[PDB]
Design an enzyme around this catalytic site. Structure first.
Site, PDB file in Angstrom:
ATOM      1  CB  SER A  45      -5.701 -29.687 -15.651  1.00 15.09           C
ATOM      2  OG  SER A  45      -6.193 -31.010 -15.899  1.00 15.09           O
ATOM      3  CE  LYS A  78      -8.603 -30.873 -18.288  1.00 17.03           C
ATOM      4  NZ  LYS A  78      -8.583 -31.613 -17.028  1.00 17.03           N
ATOM      5  CB  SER A  83      -3.164 -32.109  -9.845  1.00 19.88           C
ATOM      6  OG  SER A  83      -4.194 -32.943 -10.354  1.00 19.88           O
ATOM      7  CD  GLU A  97      -5.708 -34.119 -19.430  1.00 16.68           C
ATOM      8  OE1 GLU A  97      -5.234 -35.008 -18.696  1.00 16.68           O
ATOM      9  OE2 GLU A  97      -5.662 -32.903 -19.159  1.00 16.68           O
TER      10      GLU A  97
END
Lengths: 260, 260
Positions: free
Chosen positions: B43, B46, B210, B139
């Site tokens: 992540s 992002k 994670s 994702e």
């Protein structure tokens, strides 16, 4: 074996004194450990102060938009938001956000001043049925956390009940309740505390606190995956004035009380 | 080489693979550990996607307020904000904040789609001078973190340099840079990672990540007490497919490289 045993084993290896109150709103059950003993709130008291200002805004619609001056002399020991605004202003909304989500202590002092001092915070507590909470000092001295000192303390039981009323119940009007929950869900300081003892999928809004005597606290509303919300208070304090923070203990307590 | 010794010891005792890159903007100095090895970003990617939409908004001046439909079928595996808005809309600004501050995976997929797919995120990287970053998947599969797989990887050195350009340099326009820093400072998920290894007084904006193989990451812009900002990237991955997260390793690495 059981939860009570586990919490005592955690407390025995931790060095300090642990207090826990869980409310499971699926069935109104509770898990309690030293839940009627007094523990220094530290910055967890910022929730009561923000909530009292939200309750004021129910009759003063414009209140949260009101600018408040920040002067150099107002800065205290941890001012990550307020220092940007010295010789300028912050609105009451900004101060509430700063206090809750960034744990800014200058911002908390402005909330306390808007309430007429620490006793105004306590008076709000009493107005929403909390007979235990007491706020006696401003920042930063409210965090001294001296063992035995009743100032600036509450019990886990009382704070869990109050947090439930404020965030899930009707202590506040609906808009204000939703704003408090929004604020707590946007906390920046909590991922190492209660949240660290819970599964990845569960959502938390919380307020941490830290002070003298290694005092390490967290109060949370938890939205578990596919379950009704929980309220959890974990308070921890140590015997030496300069003890270090133990957020890991709070995470361990949260895991113990939510495992079953 | 004391910091090198401490990082290698941390790594060896953790049983994983640790990557670190620090930039100290006081003097452009660096601390580096496996800083040219690839790691799965999870992540932390992002940030690149949100920045890429910010860049688009410099020319499409109403883009951040544009409503984007959230359908039930758009939900993926962790959607704490988007599940509230299913059968409704969220703006690109709201999706960006949800992705960055709440690590909402549906939100990330809407940023990716706005950019034309994972390649649009890579293209923005290349436009700002990052020749190493690559986003290949959406994702949740960008998080598989398979050893040896170059998909959805970057190096610590490259991500530190890019984060500097985004947050402190001129990769973005002034307002957009400020908006990214505001978002990162309001992250909810970072207190157990880099932030936990730094003194309580320091101000941090970060994005965690994670994934598979116990992958545990954080990238941060740090405004230490009374010092010029730092950029710190800490990536960590492990040998077992189902290994647990190790946020504490990141905190340990941050402490080592900032202790001086």
């Amino acid at each position: 074996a059981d939860v009570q045993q586990k919490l005592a084993e955690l407390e025995r290896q931790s060095g300090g004194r642990l207090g826990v109150a869980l409310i499971n709103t699926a069935d109104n059950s509770q898990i309690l450990y030293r839940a009627d003993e007094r523990f220094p709130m530290c910055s967890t008291s910022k929730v009561m102060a923000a909530a009292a200002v939200l309750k004021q805004s129910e009759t003063q619609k414009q209140l949260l938009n009101q600018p408040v001056e920040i002067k150099p002399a107002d800065l205290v020991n941890y001012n990550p938001i307020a220092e940007k605004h010295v010789n300028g202003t912050m609105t009451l909304a900004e101060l509430s956000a700063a206090a809750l989500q960034y744990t800014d202590n200058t911002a908390m002092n402005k909330l306390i001043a808007q309430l007429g001092g620490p006793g105004g915070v306590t008076a709000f507590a009493r107005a929403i049925g909390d007979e235990t909470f007491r706020l006696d000092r401003t920042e930063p001295t409210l965090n001294t956390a001296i063992p035995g000192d009743p100032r600036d303390t509450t019990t886990p039981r009382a704070m869990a009940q109050t947090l439930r009323q404020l965030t899930l119940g009707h202590a506040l009007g609906e808009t204000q309740r939703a704003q408090l929950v929004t604020w707590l869900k946007g906390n920046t300081t909590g991922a190492a505390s209660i949240r660290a003892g819970l599964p990845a999928s569960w959502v938390v809004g919380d307020k941490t606190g830290s002070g003298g005597y290694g005092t390490t606290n967290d109060i949370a509303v938890i939205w578990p995956k596919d379950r009704a919300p929980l309220i959890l208070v974990t308070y921890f304090t140590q015997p030496q004035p300069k003890a270090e923070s133990r957020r890991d203990v709070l995470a361990s307590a949260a895991k113990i009380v939510t495992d079953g």
